[PDB]
Design an enzyme around this catalytic site. Structure first.
Site, PDB file in Angstrom:
ATOM      1  CG  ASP A  15      61.231   0.151   7.911  1.00  0.00           C
ATOM      2  OD1 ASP A  15      60.740   0.157   6.760  1.00  0.00           O
ATOM      3  OD2 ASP A  15      60.580   0.563   8.897  1.00  0.00           O
ATOM      4  NE  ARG A  29      62.666   2.579   5.034  1.00  0.00           N
ATOM      5  CZ  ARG A  29      63.320   1.479   4.682  1.00  0.00           C
ATOM      6  NH1 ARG A  29      64.486   1.156   5.217  1.00  0.00           N
ATOM      7  NH2 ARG A  29      62.804   0.678   3.758  1.00  0.00           N
ATOM      8  CG  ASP A  34      62.697  -2.922   1.432  1.00  0.00           C
ATOM      9  OD1 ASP A  34      61.666  -3.008   0.731  1.00  0.00           O
ATOM     10  OD2 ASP A  34      63.443  -1.922   1.393  1.00  0.00           O
ATOM     11  CB  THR A  35      62.231  -4.893   8.230  1.00  0.00           C
ATOM     12  OG1 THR A  35      61.545  -3.641   8.404  1.00  0.00           O
ATOM     13  CG2 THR A  35      63.666  -4.677   8.645  1.00  0.00           C
ATOM     14  CD  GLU A  37      57.005  -1.282   5.807  1.00  0.00           C
ATOM     15  OE1 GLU A  37      57.355  -1.490   4.628  1.00  0.00           O
ATOM     16  OE2 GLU A  37      56.295  -0.316   6.167  1.00  0.00           O
ATOM     17  NE  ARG A  81      60.699   7.507   5.783  1.00  0.00           N
ATOM     18  CZ  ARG A  81      60.340   6.295   5.391  1.00  0.00           C
ATOM     19  NH1 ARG A  81      59.925   5.361   6.233  1.00  0.00           N
ATOM     20  NH2 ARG A  81      60.405   6.018   4.098  1.00  0.00           N
TER      21      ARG A  81
END
Length: 135
Positions: A15, A29, A34-35, A37, A81
């Site tokens: 991500d 980002r 949402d991956t 992590e 980010r």
């Protein structure tokens, strides 16, 4: 919204990718996804975390052209980010991850929600195909 050119510096996670944007290194980002992590202790290297991470990396590392697309709302998060849609030769990395079952659509904050419908439609197909997170 419009696309602008960027240069890969380093992929960091599924991500998160570090890019050269307007001549300054910046961490980006991926908006709206949402991956699992590989980072942060707690869960550690969540399942499909290594895989989500390898997908993003190959995709940006093999591209001829990387572009970033900011949405209509804030362009930075509280950690500094950039918040963007990232494109590798024309293909949105954020969607590809979701299409592949390697990310879920995240919780959404207007007005940074321009590609929301498109992404949910890809997520619905990945769930129907029971890919990766959805198997």
């Amino acid at each position: 919204l419009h696309k602008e050119p960027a240069t890969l510096i380093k992929a960091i996670d599924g991500d998160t990718v570090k890019l050269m944007y307007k001549g300054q290194p910046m961490v980006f980002r991926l908006l709206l996804v949402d991956t699992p992590e590989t980072k942060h202790p707690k869960k550690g290297v969540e399942k499909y975390g290594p895989e989500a991470s390898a997908f993003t990396k190959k995709m940006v590392e093999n591209a001829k052209k990387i572009e970033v697309e900011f949405d209509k709302g804030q362009r930075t998060d509280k950690y500094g980010r950039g918040l963007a849609y990232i494109y590798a030769d024309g293909k949105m990395v954020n969607e590809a991850l979701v299409r592949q079952g390697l990310a879920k659509v995240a919780y959404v904050y207007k007005p940074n929600n321009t590609h929301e419908q498109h992404l949910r439609k890809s997520e619905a197909q990945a769930k129907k195909e029971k890919l990766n997170i959805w198997s």
